[PDB]
Write an enzyme that holds these catalytic residues in place. Structure first.
Site, PDB file in Angstrom:
ATOM      1  NE  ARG B  68      -2.689  -1.735   3.265  1.00 33.50           N
ATOM      2  CZ  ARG B  68      -3.140  -1.578   4.508  1.00 33.50           C
ATOM      3  NH1 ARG B  68      -3.953  -0.570   4.807  1.00 33.50           N
ATOM      4  NH2 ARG B  68      -2.769  -2.421   5.465  1.00 33.50           N
ATOM      5  CD1 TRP B 237       5.675  -5.311  -7.275  1.00 29.10           C
ATOM      6  CD2 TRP B 237       5.103  -3.469  -8.410  1.00 29.10           C
ATOM      7  NE1 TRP B 237       5.983  -4.212  -6.491  1.00 29.10           N
ATOM      8  CE2 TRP B 237       5.660  -3.073  -7.170  1.00 29.10           C
ATOM      9  CE3 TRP B 237       4.681  -2.482  -9.307  1.00 29.10           C
ATOM     10  CZ2 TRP B 237       5.778  -1.735  -6.805  1.00 29.10           C
ATOM     11  CZ3 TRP B 237       4.810  -1.156  -8.943  1.00 29.10           C
ATOM     12  CH2 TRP B 237       5.341  -0.796  -7.686  1.00 29.10           C
TER      13      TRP B 237
END
Ligand code: HEM
Ligand code: HEM
Ligand code: H4B
Ligand code: H4B
Ligand code: NRG
Ligand code: NRG
Lengths: 362, 362
Positions: B68, B237
């Site tokens: 995050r 990713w």
């Protein structure tokens, strides 16, 4: 209120215990006896059978313990008779000896007299009966950092450590009526230690690591049917990760992973090389190998998880609720290779149980 | 009740969003506009800026996500204009292409039209846009077991897989007004895949493992200010453990640890040898090495935890509460080597956020 708390815990415990021991018809009378004893004395005294089964139930209810399959084979030593510091000392020495059992470790608990008006009869300062000292002065760090506060307390009382990284702390405990605890050096003949070697990498001995054989937590309160046994040291045997993944690896403990990387011949420069992970695996292999080689009991985390799966099955078969703390049950290495990681656990507190208590040092 | 739920979520979201965007003085009027729109239409339409910041807030609030730190750099693609299956298909192809970015992966979300009366405009069946099929017939297991149910659903609709262990599932989604979903094969030129090799062990290629470049979760609902965007595929990713410790390792996924042990030259006979742990470390090294070698973005779990520590710091500095799910944030290998393992997190649900929804197959 206090008598009512006691009486309510007593009713719950005696019903469950006697139910498990095939003695359900003795409950009513025993409850009546206990009721009078509480009215008249402020408390009550467990029978030997209640105390033993209660200690066993408390282990079975210990949510953070992966080792619970073997709850019913606990060896309970009843030392409610002790009154002197010499007797406490000797009971603790005897616990070490009988629990160690020449390396074939026996799960044992020694139970001392319980609190009375919340007043402790014996107050044990050690976190475990066998533990290494720790020192931090002018930036200089020696031994086990987690022991620094207790080590300092001991040195206030006239003890002096040699300032090796593996100084055995003395036994330290206080008796009711004494202002200060007393301390006693552990006889080295009582304490098995295991040097850490690796099965394939000769240089691993260059690290000069070792650890003690038996973990004996000595600062938790055993609560059984409202009686508070604040002094009740217990032990099993180690799971290897406790030593290899935490005691020797944590940055705030012995912090050995960089030194491990160097002896196993890998660079400790790039996170993407997973050198910490690799070092952890080899250190944890070395721990298991070393204990096995020396004939000291230990369990690996895969086997321990398999046993814990059997504990879950046994609970369901017996019609008992399972409780557990997922966050402590998962091993600190390869947790997702265990079944524990893939299910959830109810973390409710069921008594009898073992509880933390405030540290008299600190 | 439904209008009131909407209106209350709307007030909360618009205040917070405009506060974060320096637009607090526009709140009153925008709220008034929204109030009329709800009365008259049953709902309301986000501005481009609200939609973008809302998707960003939802990532920031995602308790299970270690990634995050980078919440504010999300590339939000607004596809609320799509009406046809060809346009949905092309939007999904474009998402893959722009997110992949020749390996330099760009965190992206494509937002399709929201539910109306809880009625979905576009319903995406894929769990991720790129995922391998799985088959189980007469004991014979092929591909990704977690895909078996979706694979079977696709084969009901006329698709046929080649029954390799790495068949790309077609895109499969349903439009409002259609009884059945449609499916489209993925063009192979859109899909980057990485063969798994090891930096030192040549034989590791004998396993013929590979994985896809970009994880694009396509079956979660984005909720923003009471609006339900059920179709809003997103990606970052990979963290290498997702592939190396779970997708390729779990017994219920590709189950490769025994084969890994054999190629790295270790016995897989004794739990005490920690061969699963060792195999996990080498497989996870191979994954990171392979993605790096191919110029496809990936993060290791040590670096990812370090970034997440910065996210915690940034939250506190901004005066925002941190929420997290400890049980998902810890990596599945060497979790205690990360700071995450040693602290706790508040697992409360804050909106905007991403939520699970029921699978239309199954
Ligand atoms: C027989 C072998 C045993 C094994 C292998 C075992 C294993 C473990 C492990 C790995 C932990 C986590 C400790 C940590 O991370 O610090 C633990 C915690 C614990 N075990 Fe066991 N254990 C065993 C026996 C016992 C016994 C005999 C008792 C009590 C009678 C017990 C009670 C507990 C309790 C209370 C905890 C929590 C300690 C804390 O919160 O700090 N276990 N066990
Ligand atoms: C930029 C790189 C990113 C990394 C490295 C990352 C890492 C992760 C990891 C490791 C998980 C756990 C997944 C699992 O165990 O299945 C996860 C979960 C999640 N991430 Fe991220 N993430 C990233 C970007 C994003 C983005 C762009 C979004 C949304 C906009 C997002 C939303 C989530 C959500 C909602 C979950 C929970 C999924 C579930 O419950 O199955 N993350 N993240
Ligand atoms: C039910 C159990 O908590 C479950 O296995 C969870 C644990 N933590 C996890 N954490 C992550 N990141 N991903 C997962 O799939 C899981 N599985
Ligand atoms: C606060 C945080 O949950 C803490 O690091 C816990 C996690 N799980 C653990 N589990 C075990 N067995 N032992 C520990 O010391 C810890 N620490
Ligand atoms: N195995 C047991 N563990 C409790 C030990 C603390 C420990 N982690 C340490 O000293 O590493 N207890 N036990 O066996 O009663
Ligand atoms: N990294 C991310 N993870 C979600 C992936 C599911 C995954 N564990 C798997 O396919 O292995 N998301 N992301 O980057 O948006």
């Amino acid at each position: 209120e206090e008598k009512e708390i006691l009486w309510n815990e007593a009713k719950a415990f005696i019903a469950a215990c006697y139910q498990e021991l095939g003695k359900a018809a003795e409950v009513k009378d025993r409850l009546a006896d206990i009721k009078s004893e509480i009215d008249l004395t402020g408390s009550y005294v467990h029978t030997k059978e209640e105390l033993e089964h209660g200690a066993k139930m408390a282990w079975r209810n210990s949510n953070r313990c992966i080792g619970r399959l073997f709850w019913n084979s606990l060896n309970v030593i009843d030392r409610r008779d002790v009154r002197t510091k010499e007797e406490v000392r000797d009971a603790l020495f005897h616990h070490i000896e009988t629990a160690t059992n020449n390396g074939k470790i026996r799960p044992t608990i020694t139970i001392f007299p319980p609190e009375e008006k919340g007043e402790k009869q014996v107050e044990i300062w050690n976190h475990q009966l066998i533990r290494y000292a720790g020192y931090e002065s002018d930036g200089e760090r020696i031994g086990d950092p987690a022991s620094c506060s207790l080590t300092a307390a001991c040195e206030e009382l006239g003890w002096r450590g040699e300032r090796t990284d593996f100084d055995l702390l003395p036994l330290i405990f206080r008796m009711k009526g004494d202002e200060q605890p007393v301390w006693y050096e552990l006889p080295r003949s009582l304490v098995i230690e295991v040097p850490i070697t690796h099965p394939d990498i000769e240089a691993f001995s260059d690290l000069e690591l070792k650890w003690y054989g038996v973990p004996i937590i000595s600062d938790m309160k055993l609560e059984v049917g409202g009686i508070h046994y604040n002094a009740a040291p217990f032990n099993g045997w180690y799971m290897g990760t406790e030593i290899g993944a935490r005691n020797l690896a944590d940055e705030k403990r012995y912090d050995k992973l960089k030194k491990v990387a160097s002896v196993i011949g890998i660079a400790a420069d790039y996170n993407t090389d997973l050198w910490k992970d690799q070092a952890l695996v080899e250190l944890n292999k070395a721990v298991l190998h070393s204990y096995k080689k020396q004939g000291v009991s230990i369990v690996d985390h895969h086997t321990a998880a398999s046993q814990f799966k059997r504990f879950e099955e046994q609970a369901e078969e017996a019609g008992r609720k399972l409780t557990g703390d997922w966050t402590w049950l998962i091993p600190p290495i390869s947790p997702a290779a265990t079944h524990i990681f893939h299910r959830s656990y109810d973390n409710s507190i069921v008594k009898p149980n073992y509880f933390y208590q405030d540290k008299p040092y600190e």
